[PDB]
Design a protein around this ligand. Structure first.
Ligand SMILES: *[C@@H]1O[C@H](CO)[C@@H](O)[C@H](O)[C@H]1NC(C)=O
Lengths: 335, 335
């Protein structure tokens, strides 16, 4: 029933070793030359948004000598090459010589507005993909990662939009695993903001906010329960990725193609078990096996990312440049 | 002779009278082959620092299929390939199999510790360059850019570490130009914290920090005075770049090779005038000529960055990837 994560890493190094890991894991769902770029500089004005962060605003330097000015200020860009509308209605029509219309929605469904020339979603088969494996949204958080895992409680969970089926699965699974549930749904920790009470070191000096201490709180738990609000192709949100960011193993119920997005041996796919009891038994055995637990961090410690590298390459953090690149290939205002 | 205040009107007048085509007709940094990469994944642990921000921490996806895990947490990286020390003393010795020792200092002088295997500075001839033209350092700021320039007051300046030569230059120049001086040195606004008194819209809605409103305040002024604390080769700091970020023309006293870093016709180099009175006369004449003033923004509006693109390409924002690539070419721990 270990609590020292670094000791577990060392024991795994002694018994298994990264060389064995690399051989055992030496054996499409993501968007992957400087010949089509018609514009050496592209400007993007974020005209409408609901959540798009200010911390995306920048004059980025992209590949192929492309410059990309992304801003919400019409003074910085008064004649943009493209307008981005995130969950906002684009113009009804586009005449040639008007800026390109870009619509963006990362919620499940790939709901195009029908008034865009380009669509941004989480899916690779749309115009520009933006995955959730990024650091720019919710930037300015607490970055502490605990060196001690909880001895009794193994599972973290937080949900505040209590959906019937998700809550049903959560109740059934959490009845078999000692857990802390900090959200409004199925709370077993008491009040509404107990995460900062148990772990005062996770407080953000700048703030509060629900996300400023999420990673730090998760880092204390060996497992994080991650259940998406919608089961559909390529819809993998921060519920998984933040756990990977916080040295915690996610127990995942979500997109069927999740293994195209995550590193090898990094998550516990709940859909791959015959029963919830078998899942809980596996989790309880992992909580008492430091070597087998550290196998789930060997992807990070040994640098075997598998498909995770490609996933983070097309996240929100790189969205401006790639969007600018596409705008450059289309001629911008001359499309 | 128009003492203009509408910056966009000046932009449109310049567009009609001058145009981007005529502008394009009229007109050291580290640049970069994917085979020397001996490591497909590199980890960097920031072991010592004084100012390096937490929000640089991320698992970056870089060029040539390289992954780069940059963090301050020994839990995220317990066996780093490289240790970074920013203005802190590295280990006295390095044995093979130890992480590479990286020392970093962006202050003028390129002063090393003598105990590093890699040196990061602002200069291109050191191991890895990090210019000041980045957006990540003070990410949490106000992004409003004023559409109105001041009619009477033409120059913004702020300095609070009063250096003799800089203060003499500032006193002589600012006696000839209507100006607002907000720092402790040569204050003419009535005391400290006066910027938020004049421009309440520049408030950052997070705890109030000193840097939250510099760009927004500068956007109200046609010109920003930027005098470096040291005149030396390639030492161009944010005193210039923030003015470029807030649509204000900087009057620059600094590095002799500054024109290798900035866009064409983007700054006023004060050393290129016979006297400070001639400089003040040129600035006063420019403040009443909206077309000639907007020529100084044509670099941004027409997407002609010149050398500015490369400068931003090697700023702090891209430092993790570039450092990781350099470590990968050297073999990391096996050097
Ligand atoms: C301010 O602008 C007004 C209107 O253009 C003008 O009459 C006045 O002379 C200006 N004052 C200064 C100090 O520039």
């Amino acid at each position: 029933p270990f609590t020292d994560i670094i000791s577990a890493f060392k024991k795994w190094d002694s018994q298994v070793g990264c060389a064995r890991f690399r051989e055992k894991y030496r054996n499409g769902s993501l968007q992957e030359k400087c010949d089509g770029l018609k514009m050496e500089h592209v400007s993007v004005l974020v005209k409408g948004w609901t959540w798009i962060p200010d911390n995306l605003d920048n004059l980025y330097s992209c590949r192929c000598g492309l410059s990309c000015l992304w801003t919400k200020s019409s003074v910085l860009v008064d004649k943009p090459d493209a307008l981005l509308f995130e969950t906002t209605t684009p113009p009804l029509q586009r005449r040639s010589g008007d800026p390109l219309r870009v619509y963006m929605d990362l919620e499940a469904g790939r709901k195009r507005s029908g008034l865009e020339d380009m669509f941004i979603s989480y899916h690779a088969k749309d115009d520009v993909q933006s995955t959730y494996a990024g650091a720019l949204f919710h930037n300015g958080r607490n970055y502490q990662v605990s060196s001690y895992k909880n001895n009794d409680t193994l599972v973290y969970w937080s949900s505040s939009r209590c959906l019937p089926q998700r809550n049903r699965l959560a109740k059934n699974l959490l009845s078999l695993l000692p857990h802390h549930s900090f959200g409004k749904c199925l709370n077993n920790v008491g009040g509404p903001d107990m995460a900062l009470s148990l772990y005062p070191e996770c407080n953000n000096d700048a703030s509060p906010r629900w996300w400023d201490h999420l990673h730090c709180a998760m880092s204390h738990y060996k497992f994080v329960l991650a259940i998406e609000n919608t089961v559909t192709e390529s819809y993998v949100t921060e519920k998984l990725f933040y756990a990977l960011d916080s040295v915690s193993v996610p127990i995942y119920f979500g997109a069927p193609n999740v293994w195209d997005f995550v590193p090898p041996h990094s998550i516990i796919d709940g859909t791959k078990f015959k029963s919830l009891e078998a899942l809980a038994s596996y989790v309880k055995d992992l909580a008492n096996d430091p070597v087998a637990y550290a196998e789930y961090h060997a992807w990070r410690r040994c640098g075997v990312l598998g498909n995770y590298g490609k996933t983070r390459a097309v996240s929100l953090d790189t969205l401006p440049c790639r969007l600018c690149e596409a705008v450059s290939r289309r001629g911008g205002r001359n499309a």
